[PDB]
Amino acid sequence: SAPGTLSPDARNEKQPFYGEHQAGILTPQQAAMMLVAFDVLASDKADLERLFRLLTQRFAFLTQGGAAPETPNPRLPPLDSGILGGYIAPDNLTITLSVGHSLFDERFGLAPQMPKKLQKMTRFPNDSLDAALCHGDVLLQICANTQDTVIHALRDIIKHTPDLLSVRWKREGFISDHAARSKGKETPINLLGFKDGTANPDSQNDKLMQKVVWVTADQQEPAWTIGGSYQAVRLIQFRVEFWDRTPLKEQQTIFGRDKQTGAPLGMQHEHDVPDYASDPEGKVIALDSHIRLANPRTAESESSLMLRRGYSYSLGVTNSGQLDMGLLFVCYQHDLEKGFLTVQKRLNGEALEEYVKPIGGGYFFALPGVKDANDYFGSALLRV
Template identity: 40%
Template structure:
């Protein structure tokens, strides 16, 4: 049993909402084609060009392939050339086309194909590709040290972290989201193929079952603990929230990041078997939400605002002070919000009959120092959920602004 007040376990009516993660934000997506909020089906393409990169405020797709690369070339010009090739391939693939000019079968039969071919005949499936640059890229290899954002400072160690270096960090990340897992994997595979000899894969993560809604048109999903997740996320339609909490503003510094955002990733393994043996009443107290309809304890509907001052018949708070919803709520952190778009993962078992499963947390924000770091510090110190989870990987990347047109490329504002 956790430290949560057990007097509430019996007699406290269940009325709650899904998992409390720090709020999320969204606006219109950026890809060539119809705006994502107006897409007729999950097979449609998402616009590639625009003010911001696609895949941040785009309505969250069902599948993820996230990959982090180490740059192995020492030639700055070669790295820039690769980023230009990546951008051209991404512009094609997000529209449902092959990654190269001649495609999987149109080139010379004695030469390797321009595309790996596993997405032949498949639609675009809402594919988005989002790129970010890690702190390690700004060492002395490419002359970028003076352009490193202060907000890209390495994340601190949080209490309870059991991070594995081999699945953390990296120079460049690519987030591929789509409604078809094969489309997402195809995109990452072809970027890795194009980058051969210039980058090497450091780590990657497959995800399914989005754990956040980033548009009011989407129902709130559930995490692998069975609770609705991302209820408090700010949506695509909330432009003011996005401006204040997600997009780097001119003057935030440096200039090349204006219109971009910072992404934090955390692989959070859940002790599934232990959680499954925990009583429903305790599960709801830990989250501070009802497991069924997803309302905050003491409320009736999913989107009701939690009342942290409400007391039960025993005089104790209806929502415990150490409940996840309370610790992660914007009112606990000077109004700070995150744009969360994480995914569930199941990576087999650990050899002892326990599932290697949990949440691949993804959160975009204007500045990790004022958003993710204080929120996670509070959760790491006090959250009763920590008895059932452990953070095993971590990443931080600066995602530059969107692409203007076909003459632009990922990182142009950085390498110019």
């Protein structure tokens, strides 16, 4: 049921930017999203500092809204792109900034300060990673009720960083409109026609999130990272035509769930947790299945939970002529190897692989929240 969904009709609804934590992690999913990675063009630590301050300014403004910055002298470029009209509605916009492995190289001398488990994403067996769609110094996750707002945000940012950022890759996604407008009641349905994110940790549970998502002082981590979160992002293609030609029974054996209800097979309700003990040969829920491999339920690596916050995407055609569509997968963890790396390892060889093809994304660390208007992104990181 977590993190929930937020209604696309709330043009004046605001999400808090300032906080202990960044919005857009625990925040219920907005209808539209953009994942955009950048290469940082900062000369030195001081320039990186200038960028993060500037990002703070822009994010505070856009996420809360206000009248479009007008342009008193027409010899100058417009201060706003104008694609939203004369007023910049906040439209439930959240902007979540996160940093890549590559940012702690020799450029800004932040190597000693790198998060412990942060690393460059390397391939898993079913992957066909496209280098054009991988990594980046920073990633921005931009969510709002509407695609218009999201894009307006991207362009405000670009207009403000021409010598600080260069767009690396970018993908836009959505969640199924029904589940978006039902407001947390209903799970988003993916483009394979199955419900996505049923088994998520209660995101309203501020105490479980401290265990699952947030970095806490107890972990073998650099002090600045506290209140942040390891972010794993995977760009996943679906073989859609082929899928729709595949028996429903087979579709259900692959996921291990009923397609209409989202309940594990042989159980009644969507959120029913199975006992795999009773099904040693996986006659009901295959040992193959997506749900089953995703957790042996051994208790010791139930400690391996993660919050998932994915989005459908639909683009054009693939290089081979098939429909280019699937999943923008995003999950947040207190620990990257304990989270995503453990689970995907666990999932290698799953029957779903015949139908999905990971092609991009990477690992990033989502910074601590900006506490208020005198704080900024990486204020903790750049000090120390």
